[PDB]
Design a protein around this ligand. Structure first.
Ligand SMILES: *[C@@H]1O[C@H](CO)[C@@H](O[C@@H]2O[C@H](CO)[C@@H](O[C@@H]3O[C@H](CO[C@H]4O[C@H](CO[C@H]5O[C@H](CO)[C@@H](O)[C@H](O)[C@@H]5O[C@H]5O[C@H](CO)[C@@H](O)[C@H](O)[C@@H]5O)[C@@H](O)[C@H](O[C@H]5O[C@H](CO)[C@@H](O)[C@H](O)[C@@H]5O[C@H]5O[C@H](CO)[C@@H](O)[C@H](O)[C@@H]5O)[C@@H]4O)[C@@H](O)[C@H](O[C@H]4O[C@H](CO)[C@@H](O)[C@H](O)[C@@H]4O[C@H]4O[C@H](CO)[C@@H](O)[C@H](O)[C@@H]4O[C@H]4O[C@H](CO)[C@@H](O)[C@H](O)[C@@H]4O)[C@@H]3O)[C@H](O)[C@H]2NC(C)=O)[C@H](O)[C@H]1NC(C)=O
Ligand SMILES: *[C@@H]1O[C@H](CO)[C@@H](O[C@@H]2O[C@H](CO)[C@@H](O[C@@H]3O[C@H](CO[C@H]4O[C@H](CO)[C@@H](O)[C@H](O)[C@@H]4O)[C@@H](O)[C@H](O[C@H]4O[C@H](CO)[C@@H](O)[C@H](O)[C@@H]4O)[C@@H]3O)[C@H](O)[C@H]2NC(C)=O)[C@H](O)[C@H]1NC(C)=O
Ligand SMILES: *[C@@H]1O[C@H](CO)[C@@H](O[C@@H]2O[C@H](CO)[C@@H](O[C@@H]3O[C@H](CO)[C@@H](O)[C@H](O)[C@@H]3O)[C@H](O)[C@H]2NC(C)=O)[C@H](O)[C@H]1NC(C)=O
Ligand SMILES: *[C@@H]1O[C@H](CO)[C@@H](O[C@@H]2O[C@H](CO)[C@@H](O)[C@H](O)[C@H]2NC(C)=O)[C@H](O)[C@H]1NC(C)=O
Ligand SMILES: *[C@@H]1O[C@H](CO)[C@@H](O[C@@H]2O[C@H](CO)[C@@H](O)[C@H](O)[C@H]2NC(C)=O)[C@H](O)[C@H]1NC(C)=O
Ligand SMILES: *[C@@H]1O[C@H](CO)[C@@H](O[C@@H]2O[C@H](CO)[C@@H](O)[C@H](O)[C@H]2NC(C)=O)[C@H](O)[C@H]1NC(C)=O
Ligand SMILES: *[C@@H]1O[C@H](CO)[C@@H](O[C@@H]2O[C@H](CO)[C@@H](O)[C@H](O)[C@H]2NC(C)=O)[C@H](O)[C@H]1NC(C)=O
Ligand SMILES: *[C@@H]1O[C@H](CO)[C@@H](O[C@@H]2O[C@H](CO)[C@@H](O)[C@H](O)[C@H]2NC(C)=O)[C@H](O)[C@H]1NC(C)=O
Ligand SMILES: *[C@@H]1O[C@H](CO)[C@@H](O[C@@H]2O[C@H](CO)[C@@H](O)[C@H](O)[C@H]2NC(C)=O)[C@H](O)[C@H]1NC(C)=O
Ligand SMILES: *[C@@H]1O[C@H](CO)[C@@H](O[C@@H]2O[C@H](CO)[C@@H](O)[C@H](O)[C@H]2NC(C)=O)[C@H](O)[C@H]1NC(C)=O
Ligand SMILES: *[C@@H]1O[C@H](CO)[C@@H](O[C@@H]2O[C@H](CO)[C@@H](O)[C@H](O)[C@H]2NC(C)=O)[C@H](O)[C@H]1NC(C)=O
Ligand SMILES: *[C@@H]1O[C@H](CO)[C@@H](O)[C@H](O)[C@H]1NC(C)=O
Ligand SMILES: *[C@@H]1O[C@H](CO)[C@@H](O)[C@H](O)[C@H]1NC(C)=O
Ligand SMILES: *[C@@H]1O[C@H](CO)[C@@H](O)[C@H](O)[C@H]1NC(C)=O
Ligand SMILES: *[C@@H]1O[C@H](CO)[C@@H](O)[C@H](O)[C@H]1NC(C)=O
Ligand SMILES: *[C@@H]1O[C@H](CO)[C@@H](O)[C@H](O)[C@H]1NC(C)=O
Ligand SMILES: *[C@@H]1O[C@H](CO)[C@@H](O)[C@H](O)[C@H]1NC(C)=O
Ligand SMILES: *[C@@H]1O[C@H](CO)[C@@H](O)[C@H](O)[C@H]1NC(C)=O
Ligand SMILES: *[C@@H]1O[C@H](CO)[C@@H](O)[C@H](O)[C@H]1NC(C)=O
Ligand SMILES: *[C@@H]1O[C@H](CO)[C@@H](O)[C@H](O)[C@H]1NC(C)=O
Ligand SMILES: *[C@@H]1O[C@H](CO)[C@@H](O)[C@H](O)[C@H]1NC(C)=O
Ligand SMILES: *[C@@H]1O[C@H](CO)[C@@H](O)[C@H](O)[C@H]1NC(C)=O
Lengths: 106, 130, 119, 431, 35
């Protein structure tokens, strides 16, 4: 039921920069049930953030996240070459889970 | 570690049925891991297909009656495997299908919320063209 | 019994909390360590309760209003559908905030009572 | 219109590792007899994993500590590392154990340091080694590895049930699912303060004097596809096995110091016949058929049983204890694929034993006088699959030992330890 | 043979030592510092 939207559909940056990506949901998610994935062309997506602001094992400390009601933010600091590609945004509060339309970092 | 391998590309005609396998190296059992099947149309976003969790099979509303998901555990010669079957194909089903697995052992993990889940491990995905 | 009605809804579980609350020569070094740790855990729980003005109670009411950003669900949904484990997992990110607000509210209550008695 | 309400006594738990009390009826555990009270939990599904349970590690440490503490205040056998002059025994006053015993004459110290006594003993051939080839000089097996302490005369080797009772603020969850295999969800959970009587029985290839499965034979393995991981087969019908030594050893003492007494075998007066184990062939045939049928559910190939390989006395022979003597029994006849009556398995006795692979150094077991005969129940087996990894049509399983923890995972698999968090915060319309 | 050298500080000492069997002794050598 919850439909999520990502505003910066196309985004560009340079090495060493810092970028922000925003997700808006149709309903407030008080449990911070939002996950952030990264996908490079021709490869399977990789999970980076779960529970709004938690890191998986092995994910670089540069990535970070914040959650507040309907507004969720992913922050990437000291951007490197391997961090480009399509970033995806998912909710798992209400069945079924629903993904965002994705934001491309060039 | 955990590596998920799937079958190769498959090209079919409308009206037929297809099956995709997913072997999970590193998964001790599917009683503590949940299997999620996801779709990705070319140039679009991801779409949830179905779930095997605690040996219970579920599919979303858009796929009820057309998709059948099965799974068997560690046997001795092969790792645990999951299988996704599509009964009636159409021109809109051409996409990349992904097999994902998420741990469920800890009730406080934060990677799952009462059945609806995140996807920690991903397979290389298969391509189905109709 | 002890940890009975763990799968029950919170409405039915809150009725009999005292059943669970009641249960909460060279001996060997490990036995001493276990006993001391148990005493310490009990005293930590009692310190948290006493910081909020609920020293000797099982159900204690406070003056902190429930913020809808902590959880926006209905009263009936909370007290008739979920269990305690699910609820505690849902609001796990706001427990420290609520604890701090409870402590601040108790402190304000004490200071205001002292000021009123001065008058 | 809602206010925060604080509840104490909420039934919420989290996985935790703690130090459990030991109960039975530096290190000790002697509380009263437990009276278990089992409280079932309804509509509760709990995940279990027997291969990541700290109870097994705690039990290993407790057993090591108890065995080490029991051996501390008694005789050190450091004078025994001398050159032994060993010849053939005279048991005729052809036998059966005349090729396993040596009559060794040697010198020992005595009460007073300046004089020495020439004494003799009867040593089993497995407890001594030959120094120079074709010679008559022998040395104790352990003299190049560690110092040996004689088992204190008053130590009882009979295991006693041990219960592990959790402290306040913790609980033990038990899975009552009768077809449970160690890992996965459990839909019938009960809570207890502590366990049933768990006996620390040490054995290598056959599990003895244990509990039995409720309905069917259970097969446990950390990773079936891995050939280096043992397979625990838990039965539902025990097989009675008897084991006896008929030699009638004679225990005689030598005073080797100021208050230090060394007990040894003096003569073998009565029957001259190897120690042996009697088993019933038909029951073993039925048990093996059942195990084969159960294992065919996992491996789709033909299943055969073969004797162990390696040549070492340990990891090939079935090791156990009877009244204090340490038996190593040959089970080649038992696993080989006749079975039409009583199966007799040869056995040998060892005196210098190392139960924990060098953790507790080594121990000398004094001889026991009299005809010795024990009876036990086989309740489980430990197997190992030969990782040929070839294009064969058969899977070969062999008896195999390994870590002693495998003898304690077979009885602690249905237990989990959890920590209770009793604080809850809820929205109620109470101000 | 095989600022200054240590030939005046190291001494080659031969002695007898107990083996793991009390009845035989072994003649061994060691290099010890004169201090
Ligand atoms: C430890 O322990 C534990 C315990 O004890 C264990 O566990 C285990 O495990 C196992 C494994 O191994 C398991 O088993 C498994 O299971 C699974 C699951 O299942 C489930 O589900 C399903 C599905 O469902 C769905 O659908 C249907 C249709 O109708 C419906 O009805 C439902 O409802 C659902 O629906 C839903 O969903 C969907 C989607 O999906 C949608 O669409 C809709 O709409 C909805 O929503 C089902 O079916 C099932 O059921 C069953 O079961 C039950 C029980 O009770 C019963 O009752 C029923 O009747 C049924 O039965 C059947 O089956 C059986 C089997 O056996 C038989 O016997 C009988 O007779 C009958 O027939 C459930 O519910 C699954 O999946 C599986 O299966 C598999 O396997 C088997 C074996 O035999 C076989 O048979 C089958 O067939 C399958 O196979 C498949 O798959 C595989 C994998 O992949 C492959 O490989 C193969 O090849 C195959 O494939 C094929 O086929 C397919 C189809 O199927 C196709 O597609 C393809 O192409 C091909 O051809 C099994 O069964 C168990 O369960 C467990 N347990 C418990 C208690 O749970 C463990 O394991 C242990 N561990 C160790 C290590 O050992
Ligand atoms: C699996 O479980 C079985 C059953 O428990 C074990 O077999 C028993 O093992 C115990 C201990 O080794 C045996 O008990 C011993 O029996 C000896 C022989 O008994 C004779 O003498 C007694 C004297 O009353 C008679 O009643 C009896 O009928 C026999 O005539 C005793 O001599 C032993 O005495 C020792 O222990 C006592 C304890 O109080 C001391 O006071 C004594 O000084 C002495 O040290 C002892 O009682 C028992 O007989 C075995 N039963 C059977 C059926 O064999 C297995 O060992 C076990 N398997 C394992 C552990 O692997
Ligand atoms: C249980 O034992 C089996 C067998 O030893 C383990 O399977 C092995 O798993 C590893 C990784 O989990 C596999 O390595 C990977 O293989 C893929 C195959 O494409 C390769 O792409 C990777 O680079 C990596 O090499 C290995 O092949 C696999 N071997 C076999 C025989 O299956 C399994 O992981 C063990 N599971 C547990 C929980 O211990
Ligand atoms: C909500 O709380 C959970 C834990 O209760 C947070 O998840 C933790 O995040 C840290 C940071 O990476 C990890 O080290 C922990 O392992 C995580 N805990 C668990 C149980 O997974 C989560 O980040 C919190 N969410 C917000 C938005 O603050
Ligand atoms: C070890 O014991 C044997 C037998 O007690 C000794 O062999 C005897 O030596 C004497 C004197 O040399 C002979 O008269 C006997 O005939 C020998 N007996 C046998 C059976 O050959 C042997 O000398 C002892 N060795 C040591 C090192 O004490
Ligand atoms: C082990 O050896 C000792 C001595 O080598 C044996 O003791 C002798 O036994 C003979 C038997 O006829 C007697 O004549 C001697 O007087 C004994 N000597 C001593 C010093 O006791 C002993 O019998 C041997 N034991 C076995 C089982 O062969
Ligand atoms: C102590 O001595 C035993 C023999 O008495 C040694 O065990 C032997 O080790 C060699 C090493 O190559 C093997 O070839 C033999 O087969 C072994 N024999 C037995 C009976 O095990 C042992 O290695 C020695 N311990 C140490 C630390 O040197
Ligand atoms: C012990 O477990 C075995 C299973 O391994 C039981 O044997 C099965 O019993 C069922 C009963 O209906 C039969 O249908 C199967 O054919 C049996 N299988 C084999 C291989 O015999 C056995 O009955 C159990 N024994 C007890 C006393 O419960
Ligand atoms: C254990 O017993 C078995 C048989 O009882 C022994 O294996 C046999 O050894 C003889 C040698 O005398 C061979 O001729 C047979 O072919 C063997 N049979 C098998 C099935 O291997 C085995 O050597 C004994 N092991 C020990 C350590 O004594
Ligand atoms: C031991 O078990 C085997 C295996 O079950 C028995 O061999 C079977 O014997 C029956 C005759 O009653 C045949 O119908 C089967 O075909 C045999 N099995 C196989 C696999 O060929 C053997 O009879 C049993 N022996 C005893 C003494 O019980
Ligand atoms: C160990 O002792 C038991 C009991 O004394 C033996 O079992 C019985 O022994 C009596 C002899 O007193 C026989 O009459 C019975 O027939 C035996 N029962 C059985 C079921 O065999 C047992 O035989 C002894 N152990 C050995 C290896 O003989
Ligand atoms: C478990 O759920 C059933 C619903 O059918 C309920 O009747 C029962 O009371 C529940 N168990 C407990 C302990 O409340
Ligand atoms: C909830 O907390 C936020 C914290 O920023 C605050 O702005 C808001 O007013 C609070 N709502 C209520 C109803 O107290
Ligand atoms: C064994 O001892 C007996 C008497 O005890 C004696 O007659 C016999 O000759 C001896 N045999 C051997 C081989 O020492
Ligand atoms: C044993 O001791 C006796 C006297 O104490 C001595 O005469 C004899 O040489 C000794 N033998 C050995 C092998 O040390
Ligand atoms: C759960 O296990 C207990 C064990 O005593 C048994 O009595 C009870 O019938 C079981 N309940 C179910 C639903 O399997
Ligand atoms: C066993 O040996 C002792 C010791 O001499 C003896 O008293 C007893 O009668 C013997 N038992 C037999 C031969 O059965
Ligand atoms: C020795 O005893 C064993 C008992 O297992 C028996 O099988 C064997 O035949 C006996 N040997 C002789 C020579 O009596
Ligand atoms: C073996 O067991 C069968 C079946 O219970 C029985 O008939 C037979 O007498 C037993 N034989 C022995 C030696 O125990
Ligand atoms: C062996 O099993 C029988 C029957 O189940 C039982 O009576 C006996 O007490 C068991 N022995 C032991 C030592 O548990
Ligand atoms: C060591 O130093 C001394 C100095 O007194 C010298 O005579 C001798 O040759 C030196 N030995 C060497 C360098 O090997
Ligand atoms: C060492 O032992 C030998 C005998 O093996 C003896 O002749 C020699 O004098 C001993 N040396 C010393 C320094 O004790």
């Amino acid at each position: 039921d919850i439909q999520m939207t990502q505003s910066p559909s196309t985004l560009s940056a340079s090495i060493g920069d810092t970028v922000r990506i925003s997700c808006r949901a149709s309903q407030s998610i008080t449990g911070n049930w939002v996950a952030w994935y990264q996908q490079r062309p021709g490869k399977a997506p990789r999970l980076l953030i779960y529970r709004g602001a938690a890191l998986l094992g092995g994910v670089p400390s540069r990535f970070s996240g914040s959650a507040a009601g309907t507004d969720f933010t992913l922050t990437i600091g000291n951007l490197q070459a391997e961090d480009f590609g399509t970033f995806y945004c998912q909710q798992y509060d209400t069945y079924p889970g629903t993904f965002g339309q994705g934001t491309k970092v060039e | 570690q955990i590596h998920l391998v799937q079958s190769g590309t498959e090209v079919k005609k409308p009206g037929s049925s297809v099956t995709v396998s997913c072997k999970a190296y590193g998964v001790n059992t599917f009683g503590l891991y949940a299997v999620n099947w996801v779709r990705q149309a070319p140039g679009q976003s991801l779409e949830y297909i179905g779930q095997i969790w605690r040996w219970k099979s579920s599919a979303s509303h858009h796929f009820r009656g057309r998709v059948l998901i099965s799974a068997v555990d560690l046997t001795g010669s092969s790792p645990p495997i999951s299988s996704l079957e599509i009964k009636d194909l159409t021109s809109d089903d051409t996409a990349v299908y992904f097999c994902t697995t998420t741990s469920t052992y800890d009730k406080w993990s934060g990677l799952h919320h009462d059945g609806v889940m995140a996807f920690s491990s991903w397979g290389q995905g298969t391509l189905i063209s109709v | 019994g002890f940890l009975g009605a763990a799968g029950s809804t919170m409405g039915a579980a809150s009725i009999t909390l005292t059943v669970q609350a009641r249960q909460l020569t060279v001996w060997g070094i490990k036995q001493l360590q276990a006993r001391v740790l148990a005493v310490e855990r009990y005293l930590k729980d009692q310190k948290f309760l006493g910081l909020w003005g609920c020293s000797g109670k099982i159900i204690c009411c406070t003056n902190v209003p429930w913020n809808s950003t902590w959880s926006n669900k209905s009263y009936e949904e909370i007290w008739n559908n979920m269990t305690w484990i699910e609820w505690e997992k849902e609001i796990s990110n706001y427990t420290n905030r609520i604890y701090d607000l409870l402590t601040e509210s108790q402190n304000q209550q004490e200071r205001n009572e002292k000021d009123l008695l001065e008058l | 219109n809602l206010w925060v309400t604080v509840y104490y006594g909420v039934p919420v738990w989290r996985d935790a590792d703690t130090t459990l009390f030991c109960a039975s009826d530096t290190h000790a555990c002697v509380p009263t007899d437990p009276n278990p009270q089992e409280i079932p939990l309804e509509n509760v599904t709990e995940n279990f994993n027997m291969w990541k349970n700290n109870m097994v590690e705690q039990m290993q440490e407790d057993v090591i500590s108890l065995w080490d503490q029991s051996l501390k205040p008694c005789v050190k056998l450091t004078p025994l590392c001398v050159t032994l002059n060993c010849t053939k025994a005279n048991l005729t006053h052809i036998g059966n154990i005349t090729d396993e015993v040596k009559n060794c004459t040697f010198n020992m110290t005595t009460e007073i340091r300046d004089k020495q006594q020439k004494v003799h003993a009867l040593f089993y051939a497995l407890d001594i080694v030959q120094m120079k080839e074709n010679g008559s000089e022998y040395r104790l097996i352990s003299c190049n590895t560690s110092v040996i302490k004689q088992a204190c005369p008053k130590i009882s080797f009979d295991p006693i049930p041990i219960h592990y009772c959790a402290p306040a603020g913790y609980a033990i969850l038990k899975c009552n699912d009768k077809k449970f295999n160690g890992t996965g969800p459990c839909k019938n959970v009960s809570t207890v303060q502590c366990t049933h009587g768990i006996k620390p029985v040490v054995s290598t290839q056959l599990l003895l004097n244990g509990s039995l499965a409720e309905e069917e034979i259970i097969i446990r393995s950390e990773n079936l596809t891995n050939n280096a991981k043992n397979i625990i087969v838990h039965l539902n019908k025990s097989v009675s096995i008897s084991c006896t030594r008929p030699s009638n050893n004679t225990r005689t003492s030598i005073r080797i110091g100021p208050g230090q007494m060394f007990y040894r075998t003096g003569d073998i007066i009565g029957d001259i016949r190897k120690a042996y184990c009697e088993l019933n062939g038909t029951e073993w045939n039925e048990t093996l058929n059942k195990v084969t049928e159960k294992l065919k559910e996992h491996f789709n190939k033909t299943i055969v049983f073969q004797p162990p390989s390696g040549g070492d006395l340990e990891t090939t022979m079935h090791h156990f204890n009877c009244r204090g003597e340490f038996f190593y029994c040959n089970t080649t006849k038992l696993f080989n694929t006749e079975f039409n009556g009583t199966i007799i398995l040869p056995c040998r006795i060892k005196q210098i034993v190392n139960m924990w692979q060098g953790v507790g150094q080594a121990m000398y077991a004094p001889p026991i006088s009299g005809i010795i005969n024990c009876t036990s129940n086989i309740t489980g087996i430990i197997l190992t699959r030969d990782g040929g990894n070839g294009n064969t049509t058969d899977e070969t399983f062999r008896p195999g030992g390994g870590n002693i923890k495998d003898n304690w995972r077979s009885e602690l698999y249905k237990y989990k330890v959890v920590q209770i968090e009793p604080l809850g915060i809820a929205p109620t319309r109470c101000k």
